[PDB]
Amino acid sequence: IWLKVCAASDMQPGTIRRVNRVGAAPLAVYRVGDQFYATEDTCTHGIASLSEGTLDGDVIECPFHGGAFNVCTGMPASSPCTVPLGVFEVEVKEGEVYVAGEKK
Amino acid sequence: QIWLKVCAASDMQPGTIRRVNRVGAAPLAVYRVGDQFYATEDTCTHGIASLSEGTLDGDVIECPFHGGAFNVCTGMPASSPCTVPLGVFEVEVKEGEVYVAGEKKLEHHHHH
Amino acid sequence: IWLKVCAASDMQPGTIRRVNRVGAAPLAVYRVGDQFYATEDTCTHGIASLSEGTLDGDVIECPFHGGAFNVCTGMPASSPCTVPLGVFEVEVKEGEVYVAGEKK
Amino acid sequence: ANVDEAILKRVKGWAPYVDAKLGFRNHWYPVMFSKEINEGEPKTLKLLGENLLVNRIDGKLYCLKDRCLHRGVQLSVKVECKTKSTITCWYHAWTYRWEDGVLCDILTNPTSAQIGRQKLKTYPVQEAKGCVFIYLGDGDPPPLARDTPPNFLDDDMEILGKNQIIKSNWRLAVENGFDPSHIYIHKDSILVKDNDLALPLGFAPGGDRKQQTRVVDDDVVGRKGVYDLIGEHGVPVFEGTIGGEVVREGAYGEKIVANDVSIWLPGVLKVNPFPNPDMMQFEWYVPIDENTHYYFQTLGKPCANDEERKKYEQEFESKWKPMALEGFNNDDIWAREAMVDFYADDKGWVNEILFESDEAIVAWRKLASEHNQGIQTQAHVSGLEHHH
Amino acid sequence: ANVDEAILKRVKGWAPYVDAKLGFRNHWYPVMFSKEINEGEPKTLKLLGENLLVNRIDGKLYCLKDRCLHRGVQLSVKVECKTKSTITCWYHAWTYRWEDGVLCDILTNPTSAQIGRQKLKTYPVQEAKGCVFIYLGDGDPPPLARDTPPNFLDDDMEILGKNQIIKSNWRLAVENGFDPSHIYIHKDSILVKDNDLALPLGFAPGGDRKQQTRVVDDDVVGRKGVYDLIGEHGVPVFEGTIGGEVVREGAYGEKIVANDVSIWLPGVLKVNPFPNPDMMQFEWYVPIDENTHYYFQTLGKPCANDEERKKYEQEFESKWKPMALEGFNNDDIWAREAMVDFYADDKGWVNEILFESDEAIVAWRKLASEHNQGIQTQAHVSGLEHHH
Amino acid sequence: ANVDEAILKRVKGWAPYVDAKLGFRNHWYPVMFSKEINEGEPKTLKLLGENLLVNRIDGKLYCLKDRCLHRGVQLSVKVECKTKSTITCWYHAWTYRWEDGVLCDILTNPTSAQIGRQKLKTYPVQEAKGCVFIYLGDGDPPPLARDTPPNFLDDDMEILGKNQIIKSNWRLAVENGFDPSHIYIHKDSILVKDNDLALPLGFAPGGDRKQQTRVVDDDVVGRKGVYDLIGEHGVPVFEGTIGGEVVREGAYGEKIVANDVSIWLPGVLKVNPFPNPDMMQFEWYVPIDENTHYYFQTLGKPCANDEERKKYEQEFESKWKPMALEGFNNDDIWAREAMVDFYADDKGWVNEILFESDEAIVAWRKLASEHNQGIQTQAHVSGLEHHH
Ligand code: FES
Ligand code: FES
């Protein structure tokens, strides 16, 4: 049910980490302060990789057209994005980050 | 009939405007600039707007229709698109009562 | 070879003097503070007289189109000027201003 | 938004209206007649700046935005309706459902993650009185009656009309139509003589300002409009003079018409009775783009049976359409066009010098500014823009 | 402010001139010939970007702005002159007096408070030498002589001409005309051979800058202009060379012409003598809008009586008009058109690379910048603006 | 500088590309075929927004900017080549050497100080494979090989083609040509049936994104391009379905073409083999201005001798040109034109909704942004600007 991402220490606050999954679409893990979040890595407005975008607080900005989403709710924050991003469960147990292979 | 009773000087706060309706004639606008009272036609010369519904800034009244404006003392245009001077009506206070002239002033028998 | 142009004090700081030369193009002598420089007087972009231009630091601004040159190197500083100005070394001795007879 | 803020700041009584250069969003608009759209034959049109496609399936009308989500081309360039309920873009074959606009298939890549995850804009479409109305707005539409004049939808009311594209902003058309004194441009209309009409040259206003019109905001259906009452206290002008000398006369015909005139949001005029004592005229000035509008004319006449409808139909074709809709209203067309230059730079909205009868226009401007359901913007046309 | 300030700041010697894209206000300008406008025959024209109407009443000319004060339409869309002394807008019948532009009546509402309280812009008009001049300015006009070249108004000077609309800004037309070296484009003109003219290919300047021209600002009638004196110290060029080899020669005719050339504000050239040793040419480049001008051509020749006048008129129609005005000046027309692109974005005023003979043009640019009577702006066209 | 900064700010992956609406400076571009320009017959054309003049002198081609340094007129309005090696402006006779653009003479003033002190812009020109290439750039030009697809310059490669002006920005043309899924618009081409081509409707991608293309960052000659590898691990789509039902089929011909497709800077596509197993297609989309481009098509086939060349030329004129270059590519023309509106306001660069096969286009946009040799700006056209 869960996948190993990395150690909480490996990610500095305000950074993003792409998680490639065998036989499945990639995910993106974001560290906002001391809390971690995860969504699909592919922007819903096209084919861009959000892990290659810019994180400002809890909002991720797509590198392609500047669209944006809230990494917590997956809801669009900036146009042209309109389709909600898939949000996946994340939990930090024993100084290690884990992401739910399935979306909430 | 020469002077029309408007209201008590105290019925008007500084920087306010009051419309004066006259039977068989066009309405007037009385303005209180500080403790002085002035008056002009109420209808903006640039259209059909009521200047008494505009905004008074010092001695300048701004029309609510297009933003034109006039100097309430001289009736001269202060802001475009207004270009036609307002008719001015002398105002006097007798016994604390405000009175406005029934006929506008003219470039007749005055300063050269 | 040098040409005795004038007394240093004949020029107020920040001014320009046109120097006519029979059988040759006129030069422009500039007084920048207490330093003296010289170049051809005709703007390389047209027929304007740089001596009728505006001096800003070591940059002369042409009065015609706003083109400009560095009076020390003669290199264009502002468009539309593109052709480098001819420069003449200047030397002040005993309060007298001398300008090289030929470009250098 | 659509106009220089320095200008809007000056117009304190109806800035929203001046800003509404592209028309009002979230209102129903007639764009064509039912008989012009046939089963399975998608038709193109531009409404409020937006390119749209209308199709009839199983007799029902559907409206999809005529712009593929992929590379933004018009699907209409080469229509490919490969199944009854869908339309396939001719470029990369993205396929959309007419009923909900959902991207249901992509022939060039049936495994695309975009399938089922994107939706092309659709707009509600309703047919009434043989007229096709599109709700150019968002969310569930309000009843059509809200955006139609009183009686247009009367069961016994037989509606016949004409539609064309006119080169002027919709507001110029609206104001010209509701303008009490513009009646002057109709003094030589063939309808005046040929239909023995009584028609003044203008009106000498009477009563106070508020008595010049009746602002309607208490309509049960929610209609928002204004009635022109200049004739209740005014004296109609039948003899025009210059320097005291009569230079023109109005028409002294026997037929009384247009004693009941009203304008309603989003921009439809009702003239009753007109062009004849037993008829009414309902006309819309629908925004196509900032410089053009549909002049959607319709004439209504109560009819109880097919016999009456056929008779009216014959009369419409042989008399009303040519003598009235054209013979009378054609002068309105070039009159509207004549105001384009003065308002084109938006400066006319500040420099216009109004007179008494324009009180009706002012009332309309204020009502429109206060009761419109939204201001269409170029961003709506290209794609809404918002930064977090 | 008609041009980007960044550009204007760059042009120290003649910024006002570069900014005068629409021409100079407060000057007299010819717009048509007297015989082109007859009694009660209203004519429309655009001058300095303003739409005007001219009419002849009891022989006298009057000029009114072709734009109703009410809703800004052009009165000329449907002219209505119901009385000899007035014109009535076709829209709501506001009526103005040609004599002073006063709104004297309104047929749609004889009780309107606007009556007698609005005035439509009027402009002074004067006829002289068969030409119609309009003073496009405010206040009392100065004598017409101030805006005409010397001798144009001479008693015996018979004036004949031609006028047309050319597609180029007026300044490009002025500079081409006063351009000493542009004479090169006329080397193959039919007039050169057919009238045995001596015509150089150009000039090799001599003397200093001040000697190339004569700036006139001391003329008693107040006219302001510049004489082209390049030929006083310069050697005319009759042998054009490339690599020192003669590839083209000038014309060695016996008739000497154009040795007295001057340009005057607001923009009229005087070439004397031309196109014949006993004639003079005066031509105006009148600003219509930023992209067009009237090319008002006139040829003057002293005539003592109706006999000589008739003879001249016959020579004008059979020779001078076709051989000179057209056969010679037609090349000036496309030459002007060829400079449009370079200056259309206003960048040419910065990027142009001038040579010696352009000293004449520079002199004119400076004189115009310093002595023009005002810069026409878009605000004059739409309506002057000013906030308290 | 060519696009609103607020838009460029949003496009972090290829802002330079979006900004390059006028094209990339400092690259070679084909503009015509050698046979189109003969000895001593100057020809005009516009490239990257600049008006140019090309002339053949002693068999060799030379290129000068078609704009006189003096007053900015096009020299071509009236061509005056008075000596074999020069061109004289028709206005004031400024004369330039075709060889280096130097202002060598001025017929109107042989004593001008400008002579020998100004230089009209020249551009390198090279003829290859019967095609005329111009290096629209500054400084010493790189080998033509850098800006041409692999093999175009092969000794035995026989090149034949066609050129025309198309109304769309060059980038829309480039992307359409390199678009893997656009093959759908070609499903009914006469070439598919008449040349028995196997042609799918599209592809269902396979493998990771990195495997969808192959970027070439450097060649022995510095070439910069991208190969489309969607067919490497992708599944060709031959049956188009909607709701699970087949509504269209690809073409089941025997000829397999377009083994490899690649796009190269400055913007030239190579399809191999095409339209026949033994041929190749090389096509450029050359920027003329922001709204148009030259669609320079060429077909190459190795030929060992005059005998094979003759035959090929016969087959080209009789079959390939009409059936492929026109019968196949004509659909590409209107597809490009169909994307104009969406990108015309630059907003399409933000609102486009891309899908999987667009990885190819994205790779090209990034490569173009990263390796172009310069962004052509309007300032390059009017004259570079810089304020101290
Ligand atoms: S692909 Fe993310 S904003 Fe367009
Ligand atoms: S009505 Fe007052 S400014 Fe226009």
Ligand code: FES
């Ligand atoms: S003449 Fe000096 S910048 Fe043009």
Ligand code: FES
């Ligand atoms: S533009 Fe419609 S499917 Fe690509």
Ligand code: FES
């Ligand atoms: S526009 Fe002229 S009278 Fe109304």
Ligand code: FES
């Ligand atoms: S514009 Fe070419 S020589 Fe003057």
Ligand SMILES: [Fe+2]
């Ligand atoms: Fe009407």
Ligand SMILES: [Fe+2]
């Ligand atoms: Fe000339």
Ligand SMILES: [Fe+2]
């Ligand atoms: Fe194609």
